[PDB]
């Protein structure tokens, strides 16, 4: 078998072992939790093996398997530079997502581990599939496990939060399905190699655009359609929050490099001013209302909306720099949003049972290790240099300015507004006076568990900020394939 199918079977094998260990011993929950964690590490070791062998300048899909047997629906796995880093991000997060929530679950622990081990397979598949209906199949197979993750292990407003995520994601994704079905009808298959050769008529493209963008606008999400995230992320367990922000919010970002940039170019060009108008508005409104949010975990969720808008305008720039910056800002968001969710949902909520910023003040005085990491993750949310978040924003913002200058000029105001809320949240929890008086007893500082996942996430954010060429050298040639345009003296060569 191939090496991309080993990525999928290992999390499935872990599901089987958790389900059968009680049949060999009444077994401890600690034994269930070591199985799930060792299983996620092995997937991460395979994924690092794949990256060692990967060819950074190859236009053919790699690590494929000769099917040679065709059915109505068949799984085709391959890897290109555009997808390798999304796979790696999924395989670094899932181990931390389990470790972060190691003590906080308490009840239904096997069910919790099985859903995450199942989510890892489904989110890994969505990057590995070489068809657009298979992309849709896994881009939407994650909705039943996430409905039950929030309902079983979520917070107080969990029932409504889980109904919002499922119904919005189901509704938005059913307009994508209509567009995909139309392309398959006109071409006869959704396999990428055959679909990317095909050129659609402008009118077909302009209606295929209306339907892929409606799906992506709901799943980005844009400002007037972001209600599900404000509920889903907050009421979700800590581990579910880490997956939904770092990995699920990136499915729409990676879906533009497949469903829009290569097959609907004329539509993307003539409609970019609509995208940029929306993206600009969701940069401003999201940021203004992130300043006045009183739930800390919902202040981290709102921050994600503003960042997704910068990377959405980057994917619509028709520029090499804004396209690579969009992937860098999505990788950067994956580490930093994970840390800020760990701080809000996994350290404060663990010690106080509250998420209201009214109750927190002067936390640096009694918890100096938490405040150090919390400061670094707030600076990265603010796009400070020396973090990968700055590189992605700069390249995403430059391609936005080069495409349509005015919108990138409004979008550049994210430098003042992301800074505003990030420091304001920081000064109100870590600083802002002496330790609050609402704390009856003293709180312990970071545990060796809390410290080492925060340190690991910060380490990826800073090291990749210094030397982004670790990710940039892989995307160059493959990004080169999604640009639409010619130059008058460089084209049509004889």
């Amino acid at each position: 078998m191939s090496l991309l199918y080993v990525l999928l079977i290992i999390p499935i094998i872990g599901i089987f072992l958790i389900s059968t260990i009680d049949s060999f011993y009444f077994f401890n929950v600690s034994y269930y939790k070591k199985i799930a964690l060792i299983t996620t590490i092995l997937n991460l070791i395979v994924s690092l093996i794949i990256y060692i062998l990967f060819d950074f300048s190859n236009n053919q899909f790699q690590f494929i398997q000769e099917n040679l047997d065709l059915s109505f629906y068949d799984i085709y796995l391959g890897v290109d530079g555009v997808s390798i880093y999304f796979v790696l991000l999924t395989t670094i997060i899932m181990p931390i997502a389990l470790v972060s929530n190691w003590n906080s679950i308490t009840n239904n622990i096997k069910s919790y581990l099985i859903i995450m081990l199942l989510l890892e397979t489904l989110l890994l598949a969505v990057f590995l599939v070489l068809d657009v209906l298979l992309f849709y199949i896994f881009f939407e197979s994650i909705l039943p496990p996430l409905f039950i993750l929030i309902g079983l292990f979520g917070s107080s407003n969990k029932v409504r939060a889980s109904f919002y995520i499922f119904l919005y994601t189901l509704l938005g994704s059913l307009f994508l399905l209509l567009s995909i079905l139309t392309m398959s009808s006109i071409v006869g298959t959704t396999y990428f190699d055959v679909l990317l050769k095909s050129s659609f008529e402008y009118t077909t493209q302009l209606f295929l655009f209306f339907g892929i963008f409606i799906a992506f606008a709901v799943k980005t999400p844009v400002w007037g359609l972001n209600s599900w995230l404000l509920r889903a992320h907050v009421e979700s367990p800590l581990g579910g929050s880490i997956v939904l922000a770092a990995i699920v919010l990136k499915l729409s970002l990676y879906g533009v490099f497949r469903l829009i940039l290569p097959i609907l170019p004329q539509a993307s060009l003539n409609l970019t001013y609509i995208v940029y108008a929306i993206g600009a508005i969701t940069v401003l409104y999201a940021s203004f209302s992130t300043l006045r949010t009183v739930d800390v975990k919902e202040l981290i969720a709102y921050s994600s909306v503003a960042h997704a808008a910068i990377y959405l305008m980057g994917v619509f720039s028709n520029t090499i720099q804004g396209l690579e910056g969009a992937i860098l800002l999505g990788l950067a968001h994956g580490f930093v949003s994970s840390g800020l969710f760990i701080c809000a949902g996994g350290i404060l909520y663990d010690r106080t049972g509250t998420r209201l910023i009214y109750f927190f003040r002067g936390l640096t005085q009694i918890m100096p290790l938490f405040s150090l990491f919390f400061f670094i993750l707030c600076l990265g949310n603010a796009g400070t240099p020396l973090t990968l978040n700055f590189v992605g924003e700069f390249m995403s913002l430059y391609g936005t300015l080069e495409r349509l200058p005015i919108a990138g000029m409004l979008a550049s105001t994210s430098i003042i507004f992301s800074a505003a809320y990030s420091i304001y949240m920081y000064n109100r929890i870590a600083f802002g006076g002496s330790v609050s008086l609402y704390f009856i007893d003293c709180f312990r500082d970071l545990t060796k568990r809390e410290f080492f996942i925060l340190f690991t996430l910060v380490s990826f954010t800073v090291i990749l900020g210094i030397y982004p060429s670790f990710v940039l050298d892989g995307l160059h040639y493959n990004i080169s394939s999604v640009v639409y345009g010619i130059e008058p003296n460089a084209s049509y060569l004889t």
Binding site: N103, S104, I105, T106, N107, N157, G224, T272, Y273, I274, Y276, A277, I278, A280, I281, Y285, V294, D295, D350, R351, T352, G353, T354, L356, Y358, F359, L404, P405, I406, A407, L410, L437, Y438, F439, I440, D441, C442, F443
Partner: protein
């Protein structure tokens, strides 16, 4: 779930946080809420979108030197 440390939960702040959470259940359509909603959701995006269309492809700065014009169109 896990026992948390003791917090002097202020009844006033707890009911305020409850108020913010259930607030939508009481939104009405008034002359005022429509005016704010129409401004934010229609007018500002339509103004930003209109300028986006009018200035689209209007300027390019690459390699433009003296004697050349920034304006493409």
């Amino acid at each position: 779930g896990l026992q948390h440390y003791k917090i002097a939960m202020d009844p006033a702040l707890v009911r305020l946080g409850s108020m913010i959470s259930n607030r939508y259940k009481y939104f009405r359509w008034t002359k005022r809420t429509a005016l704010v909603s129409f401004m934010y959701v229609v007018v500002v995006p339509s103004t930003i979108g209109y300028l986006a269309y009018k200035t689209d492809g209007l300027w390019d700065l690459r390699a433009k030197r003296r004697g050349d014009l920034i304006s493409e169109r």
